[PDB]
Symmetry: D2
Subunit: 109 residues, 4 copies
């Protein structure tokens, strides 16, 4: 697929499983229009978000619902979510998660 | 001050100087209202954004203009910006340091939260 | 395999390809004995380092030759290498690379 | 001072206090010779490790005892330690800040290098 999301748990040394992910595309309004969503799998991956035809050049945002994930683990987190915003010009967006920290990386091949 | 932003360049091993930072607070109607803004200094720090009085409980967004920083250095980076969104002061007033470490295709953000 | 190494390039948004990796096992001497090595593939992965039988409990070190990688790219780096040292009690050791920074993460499933 | 170490806890969003740090320098015979040591403070900083005179050109190793820090907090972490290995001062004297951000199954290290 044109776009993949991968999430990791730095506390537990594991894939971050069942994490909600929402993808938005910026409308001509300058508002975000919902585009695709899903939850990460047991391998911490989310696949099948979009297709090559659909995934045109644009400014896209991916919101990962980190706070819900931490809440289910009974660990109190800092962020509301982790947002990745990029201009789409294969994208793997990877996120590594900690309660008071996250990093996000793009692997574009 | 209650909120501080610090930015680092992971490519040069330096502070990230002259980076724009825009801060927003979630309104009653769920909109993001402009709250404060500034540029990082020679040390890559931004101080004086707000005050103990002004910085009330709320959901806040700190948006760091990473793209402009990379572009001025000749790089076309992946991200539009780095944005940090968090609930502040709901246990009482705290001091927040929002740190960001920048790479062209990656960034990390960390919060150091302390009690006056 | 029991042990996998994965390397990413934060400057280029890509797998870190052809990066030298050496694995050591701590001897009763308190010295490191060479154990396995390889170079990362076009996908930035290094597989087939060891086998379950061979990979007994121990304290292991994985040295990733980051400086050579940066040198080939004509970007001057800070570290001599990135070293990961752990007690082995499936391990994926992932490294994300920048010239003056790296992070390493373990995913243990 | 020429070399400073700073450590942060990515789980609690605080400085990592009372963390042991051991510094080594590569000898002529290729062995690692003990060079300096200390513990991080309340701010998670370690200052005063060395001096402009002492801190000559060389390959240096900074080993941060992450395992003991996690264990005292009840966590069994992945890493034995975080170790940073670098060539120092070969362009002339510099000031080095070695920063580490800690998680139980992950860590990152960054260097901020500046010119007196
Ligand atoms: O892309 C990936 C990635 O980034 C990480 C990772 C490494 C360091 C980080 O800081 C964050 C994530 O693990 C991965 C593991 C995979 O099997 C595949 C990947 O593509 C990634
Ligand atoms: O100098 C600092 C620094 O380099 C970092 C840092 C940022 C991102 C990381 O991933 C790791 C460390 O945090 C800091 C946090 C502070 O409150 C004060 C600092 O001076 C630093």
């Amino acid at each position: 697929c044109p776009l993949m999301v991968k999430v990791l748990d730095a506390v537990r040394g594991s894939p971050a499983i069942n994490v909600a992910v929402h993808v938005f595309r910026k409308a001509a309004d300058d508002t975000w229009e919902p585009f695709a969503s899903g939850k990460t799998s047991e391998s911490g991956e989310l696949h099948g978000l979009t297709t090559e035809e659909e995934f045109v050049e644009g400014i896209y945002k991916v919101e990962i619902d980190t706070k819900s994930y931490w809440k289910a683990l009974g660990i109190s987190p800092f962020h509301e979510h982790a947002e990745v915003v990029f201009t789409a010009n294969r994208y793997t967006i990877a996120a590594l998660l900690s309660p008071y920290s996250y990093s996000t990386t793009a692997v574009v091949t």
